[PDB]
C-alpha cells in the first residue's frame, strides 16, 4: 500500500512538527480518516514505518480512540451528542429529523456511503443543546428544514 503524494506530504508534516515523530500519531490518523473517510487497515503498516513505531502499537492506538473508524467508509460523519443535557433538550428530535432526511439511524451509513450517524458523548456545547457535528463543523439542531439546509452543503 502507498499513500498518495498529497496525503503523504501532510503526514510527513505532522511527523516533523513534534520533537518526536511518534507524538504525531493522532494527527496522522486524523489525516488518514479525512482523506479516505475511514482508516484503511492496510494504511497502518506504512504509517507505523513513518512513525518508527511497531505495527501493533499503531493498531492498538486506532482501536482505543473512539473517533477513528476502521470498518465504515463515509464522506461525512454526523456526530450526534447523546449525553445528558442534549438528551434533556431533545436529542431524539434531531435523530428523528436525520431519519426523515437520510433514512438512517445511529451507527448506520447511507447506501450512498456518504453519511454515517455517529452517536457521541458530550460535545462541550450543552447550552446550545441539542448539538451535532458534520465532520469538523458543529451546529445546534433547531428544525428539520434547517438540518436539511445544513446537510445540503455537503455533497
Amino acid at each position: 500500500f502507498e499513500f498518495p503524494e498529497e496525503l503523504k506530504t501532510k503526514l510527513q508534516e505532522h511527523i516533523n512538527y513534534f520533537p518526536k515523530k511518534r507524538q504525531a500519531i493522532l494527527l496522522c490518523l486524523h489525516e488518514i480518516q479525512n482523506y479516505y473517510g475511514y482508516i484503511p487497515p492496510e494504511s497502518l503498516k506504512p504509517l507505523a514505518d513513518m512513525l518508527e513505531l511497531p505495527l501493533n502499537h499503531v493498531e492498538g492506538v486506532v482501536a482505543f480512540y473512539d473517533m477513528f473508524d476502521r470498518e465504515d467508509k463515509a464522506k461525512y460523519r454526523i456526530r450526534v451528542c447523546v449525553s445528558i443535557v442534549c438528551h434533556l433538550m431533545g436529542t431524539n428530535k434531531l435523530l428523528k429529523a436525520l431519519e426523515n432526511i437520510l433514512g438512517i439511524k445511529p451507527g448506520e451509513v447511507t447506501p450512498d456511503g456518504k453519511f454515517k450517524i455517529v452517536p457521541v458523548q458530550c460535545l462541550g456545547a450543552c447550552s446550545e443543546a441539542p448539538m451535532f457535528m458534520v465532520n469538523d463543523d458543529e451546529y445546534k439542531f433547531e428544525s428539520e428544514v434547517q438540518l436539511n439546509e445544513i446537510l445540503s452543503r455537503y455533497t
Binding site: 445528558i84 446550545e128 469538523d136
Partner: protein
C-alpha cells in the same frame, strides 16, 4: 476561516477572562494588543521565575480543571525537581455540561497563550503543549494560527523580549477519549500511546512527559495568570473571597432561560447562578436538582451554597446542569451511568465491570425489566466501582448516582 461552531452565550460581572470572550468571535493578536494584551508577559519577564510562583501562590489561584489544587504550590513542587521541565495546557474538556474552556480558546486564544508563556517561564519549561480534544477542530486551528501570530510578534521563539527565555508551544489533538483529560493519560496520549492513566506515584510534577517534571494546568487556570501578574496578587485576592479568589467561569445548561457561560466570583451562591444570572428556570418550573457535571448531584435544598472549593462549596469545575420538577432523576442517572460506561479505559477490573454493570442494570431498572436481584446488584455495583482504581474516574463513576439514591429516594422507589 474556521469550522463552524455554536454561538454560546457569555456574560461577565468582572470583565476579566470574558473581557473579549464575551463576544463570540476570534480576537486576533492586533485586537488583543490594542486591548492591553501581552503587557503581563512583559512585566513577568522582568520578574524572576520564583517571584512569579510566589505571586501565583499568594493569589490563592486554584486549579479550575476539577481538583481545585493550589496552582502556585503545584509549580513549587515541580521546580523542586531538576529540569528540563514541560508545561502542558489541558484542553480536553469532555465532561457532560462543561463548555467553559472552549470560549476562551475559540474567542480569546492570546489570553491562554500569554498565560502559557508566563507559566512556562515560571517553572523553567522551554517546551509547552496544548492537548485539545479532537472534537474541537476549530479550537485547534484557532490556536495554531494564534501561536504563529504570537511567534511573528516575538512573544514565542528564542530570547523572548530579550529575556533570554526560549519557548515553543505545540498543539496536540485528542481522538475521542474522555480519559485523556486525566493528567497521566493525557501525557500517555502526548507520547503517542493509548490514553491509559499511569499508576501514581510518581506524580507528573516529578515524572511526567518523557519522565521529566511536568506541570499540567487547565485552560481556565492558565487564563488567570496574566491577571495575577497584571493586577498583582493583592488586587487579585480582593476579587471574590480572600479564601478562593479570582473570576470563575460557570457553564450553565439545562432548563434555565439563559444557558451559557457566566464569569462570576466564587462567593456567588448556586441559587444566584440559576435565578439572578441565568434568568431562573424555563417556564418558572421548580428546580429539582443540579448536576455538577457528572460528579455530584445537589437537591433544591442545597442551592444556598457558594460556588467555591470550600468543604460545603459546589466545587468541581462549576458546571451547572439544571433539572426541573418535570425531569425524571432515574432517566438522568442513566445518562450519567451511560457516560461512565463509555469512558472507562478498562485497565482496572472493578471500574471496567462496574461502569458497564451500573449502566446495564440501571437501564433494566428504567425499562422496568429489573428483578429484585438486579436492584440489589445495582446497589452493590454502584458502591464497588472504585476498588483498585488507579485514576479518579473509577472513584467518582458511582458518586452522582449514589447521591440521587440518597437525595431522591421516592423517585427510585416508584421504579421498584
Amino acid at each position: 476561516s474556521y469550522p463552524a461552531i455554536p454561538r454560546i452565550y457569555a456574560e461577565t460581572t468582572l470583565n476579566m477572562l470574558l473581557k473579549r470572550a464575551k463576544k463570540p468571535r476570534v480576537h486576533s493578536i492586533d485586537e488583543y494588543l490594542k486591548d492591553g494584551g501581552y503587557q503581563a508577559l512583559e512585566k513577568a519577564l522582568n520578574m524572576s521565575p520564583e517571584e512569579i510562583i510566589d505571586w501565583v501562590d499568594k493569589s490563592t489561584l486554584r486549579g479550575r480543571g476539577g481538583a481545585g489544587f493550589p496552582t502556585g504550590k503545584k509549580w513549587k513542587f515541580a521546580v523542586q525537581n531538576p529540569g528540563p521541565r514541560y508545561f502542558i495546557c489541558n484542553a480536553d474538556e469532555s465532561e457532560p455540561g462543561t463548555f467553559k474552556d472552549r470560549i476562551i480558546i475559540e474567542r480569546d486564544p492570546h489570553l491562554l497563550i500569554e498565560g502559557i508563556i508566563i507559566s512556562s517561564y515560571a517553572i523553567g519549561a522551554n517546551e509547552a503543549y496544548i492537548y485539545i480534544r479532537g472534537e474541537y477542530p476549530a479550537g485547534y486551528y484557532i490556536l495554531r494560527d494564534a501561536i504563529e501570530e504570537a511567534k511573528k510578534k516575538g512573544f514565542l521563539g528564542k530570547n523572548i523580549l530579550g529575556s533570554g527565555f526560549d519557548l515553543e508551544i505545540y498543539v496536540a489533538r485528542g481522538a475521542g477519549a474522555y480519559i485523556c483529560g486525566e493528567e497521566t493519560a493525557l501525557i500517555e496520549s502526548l507520547e503517542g500511546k493509548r490514553g491509559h492513566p499511569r499508576l501514581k506515584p510518581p506524580y507528573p510534577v516529578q515524572k511526567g512527559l518523557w519522565g521529566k517534571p511536568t506541570v499540567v494546568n487547565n485552560v481556565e487556570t492558565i487564563a488567570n495568570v496574566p491577571f495575577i501578574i497584571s493586577m498583582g496578587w493583592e488586587e487579585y485576592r480582593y476579587i471574590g473571597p480572600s479564601d478562593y479568589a479570582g473570576p470563575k467561569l460557570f457553564p450553565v445548561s439545562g432548563k434555565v432561560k439563559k444557558p451559557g457561560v457566566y464569569e462570576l466570583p466564587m462567593n456567588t451562591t448556586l441559587r444566584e447562578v440559576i435565578f439572578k444570572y441565568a434568568g431562573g428556570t424555563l417556564g418558572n418550573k421548580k428546580v429539582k436538582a443540579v448536576f455538577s457535571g457528572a460528579l455530584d448531584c445537589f437537591s433544591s435544598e442545597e442551592l444556598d451554597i457558594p460556588m467555591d472549593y470550600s468543604p460545603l462549596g459546589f466545587g468541581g469545575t462549576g458546571t451547572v446542569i439544571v433539572l426541573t420538577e418535570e425531569d425524571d432523576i432515574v432517566e438522568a442517572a442513566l445518562k450519567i451511568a451511560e457516560f461512565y460506561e463509555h469512558e472507562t479505559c478498562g485497565q482496572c477490573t472493578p471500574c471496567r465491570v462496574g461502569c458497564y454493570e451500573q449502566a446495564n442494570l440501571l437501564e433494566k431498572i428504567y425499562k422496568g425489566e429489573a428483578t429484585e436481584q438486579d436492584w440489589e446488584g445495582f446497589d452493590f455495583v454502584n458502591r464497588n466501582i472504585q476498588p483498585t482504581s488507579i485514576c479518579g474516574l473509577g472513584a467518582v463513576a458511582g458518586r452522582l448516582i449514589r447521591q440521587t439514591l440518597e437525595k431522591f429516594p421516592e423517585e427510585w422507589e416508584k421504579y421498584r
